[PDB]
């Protein structure tokens, strides 16, 4: 057993809920955390969140950016700035943004502007990894 807590600033999903394993899109690829997983802190990356429920059927979500935490005792918490379910995201407008984002990349030389446009590329390029 492990208590799982997953939420955003606007909406709450899990609160000390009994769950066996969770997959998280961290910076270091995608880490999988089981019931008695090691104490490892890793920050988030735009991608897919897999939450293995207690009854065979799994719910999956999409994240923009945030943080996950696994502790010295069996308890996990995951938070994101804006996390939305696969249900409410359009596959149309995601390509419109990506192509506009890959246009400003070659039209900006400033070292500060380059990072800001590439992050938007990364986020929009992750919007097709699920839809």
């Amino acid at each position: 057993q492990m208590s799982f807590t997953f939420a955003s600033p606007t909406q709450v999903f899990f609160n000390s809920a009994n769950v066996r394993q969770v997959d998280v899109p961290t910076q270091t690829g995608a880490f999988g955390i089981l019931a008695a997983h090691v104490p490892t802190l890793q920050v988030l990356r735009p991608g897919l969140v897999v939450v293995h429920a207690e009854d065979g059927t799994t719910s999956k979500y999409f994240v923009s950016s945030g943080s996950v935490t696994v502790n010295a005792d069996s308890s996990v918490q995951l938070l994101a700035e804006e996390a939305v379910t696969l249900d409410m995201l359009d596959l149309g407008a995601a390509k419109a943004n990506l192509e506009k984002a890959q246009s400003e990349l070659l039209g900006a030389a400033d070292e500060a502007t380059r990072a800001e446009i590439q992050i938007r590329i990364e986020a929009n390029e992750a919007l097709v990894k699920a839809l």
Binding site: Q21, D23, G32, H52
Partner: protein, 72 residues
């Protein structure tokens, strides 16, 4: 000379299965730590393990084809 060097030369080609056996422990070991980060067990990960061990034991079956061609 024509039959003697065919028995000690089919033994040196049996050391070519040292790569297929140590390589199989690397194609399955890197699949153990692979599914440890999880979660695609059936399909994707273990499916790529089968296409990897087949390309690992292929240098064991071809090396046992040069072994049996020296004794039979």
């Amino acid at each position: 000379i024509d039959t003697a060097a065919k028995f000690i030369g089919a033994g040196a080609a049996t050391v070519g299965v040292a790569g297929s056996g140590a390589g199989i422990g690397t194609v399955f070991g890197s699949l153990i730590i692979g599914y440890a980060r999880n979660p695609s067990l059936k399909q994707q990960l273990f499916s790529y393990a089968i296409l990897g061990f087949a390309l690992s034991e292929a240098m064991g079956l071809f090396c046992l084809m040069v072994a049996f061609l020296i004794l039979f």
